[model samples]
Target: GSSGSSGTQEELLRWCQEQTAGYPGVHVSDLSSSWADGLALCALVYRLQPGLLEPSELQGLGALEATAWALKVAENELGITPVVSAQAVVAGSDPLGLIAYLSHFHSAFKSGPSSG
Candidate 1:
């Protein structure tokens, strides 16, 4: 299939990377060869605060999961939950912060409604 090639995935991820382009503080590193290391780095960065996540951060995680899912790499048991837990604690502890976080990325990324 056209979707199975590394080139195809690269193109897809490249397009995704472009969509987040010029983000002042966001950087997307290619870690297809080492997802565990990548996830560890992401967790360390996002797990500091109680939940330590804004809505936008959650959405970004969802996007990452979605991309992995599309590539048939989304396993049932993974690091997604812990990552979300970190962010959830943060958001729960600070309602206003959650609102601000969601509102900020909603405007910037313009993420549409989820499919399901």
Candidate 2:
């Protein structure tokens, strides 16, 4: 069954901690109070700078709006519940698996020929 639609800030933080437990070196930072806030910030920056993300990536919406779309895709199409976390990405180390997961979505969009 699907996990519910939204999670509390505390729940999200706890989930991040649990998810990164296997990676001893991973450091998680609480970026936003909620996922919606984070996505809104992304959109705000994108709105100020239209080129923040690729034009095709924007899909006619600003950068921030596209982020919400991405989350929806992860949930509906990929069956992956999206969560927001912050950590520094070292050159060759991805302790939290975020880099690989992000890369997967990056490739998914770039390799396809659709409206996503």
Candidate 3:
């Protein structure tokens, strides 16, 4: 039950939480510590495109490394650019930057995987 425009972060964050609900270690909440480890982004990337690479490999990397790695994959594979540097996300995510980045996925996630 949200109000106002469809661009609200509350709505986006809620949708994100639902979209990645069953993903491993990706309890999508807010845009801070919940995503600090980079697992959330990795999980979402895995969801949008599976079998591209094993999650196990990226999971072993450190926070910043993992985030940069995940961001690279999303940019190259998913066409979603990293709006904010990993340093910001690790230091403490920029709410707008995080929101803008994830907003790109909303349409893709809703459209379902390619099968035309």
Candidate 4:
């Protein structure tokens, strides 16, 4: 049988902790979504800026609206910050359309960006 959609944040966090705990010298801080999301948002910033890299915790480039929400959540729950790189990227790029098209699978499964 296929697994149904939906998993709680607590469940995900616990899984992440358990998986990373096996390794030595790994702080829970190191295994933070904040850092991971920061890296993803940084990539977006780089794509926006010519040579600058703005820090953020808004990763999950899977979907624009979802990414936007995730970014906000990262800021709220993880305390990761977002930086201004270039508004042009968001203003000029239609990431939302691309995100929507690619999200067909997720939609079929009735899941959002955080499904995994």
* C-alpha RMSD values across all candidates: 15.3, 15.8, 5.4, 13.9
Task: Tell me the TM-score of model 4.
Answer: 0.23
Winner on TM-score (1 vs 2): 2
Task: Assess the local accuracy of residue 111 in candidate 4 as a C-alpha lDDT between 0 and 100.
Answer: 27
Residue 70, model 3: Cα distance from true site in angstroms: 1.4
Q: Top lDDT: which candidate number?
A: 3
lDDT of each: 0.31, 0.37, 0.72, 0.33
lDDT of 4 by residue, 1-116 (tens): 22333454343333334433443322233222322322333332233233442323233333233235434433444333433212312333443332332133223323234455
TM-score of each: 0.24, 0.28, 0.76, 0.23
Compared with the true structure, what per-residue lDDT tens digits does model 3 show for residues 46-103? 7777767867767678877777877888899988888888878766847567767877
Q: Which segments of model 4 are wrong by more than 4 Å?
A: 1-6, 29-116
Off by over 4 Å in 1: 1-7, 31-116
In model 3, which residue pairs have backbone atoms overlapping below 3 Å? Answer: none
lDDT of 1 by residue, 7-92 (tens): 32343344334433443333444423222212322332332222434234433554344233312221222222232223332324
Better of 2 and 4 by TM-score: 2
Candidate 2 off by > 4 Å: 1-58, 85-116
Is candidate 1 or 4 superior in lDDT? 4
**Candidate 3 to truth, TM:** 0.76
Tell me the deviation in Å of residue 23 in model 4: 1.1
In model 1, what is the error at residue 75, expressed in angstroms?
18
Q: What is the lDDT of residue 104 in candidate 3?
A: 85
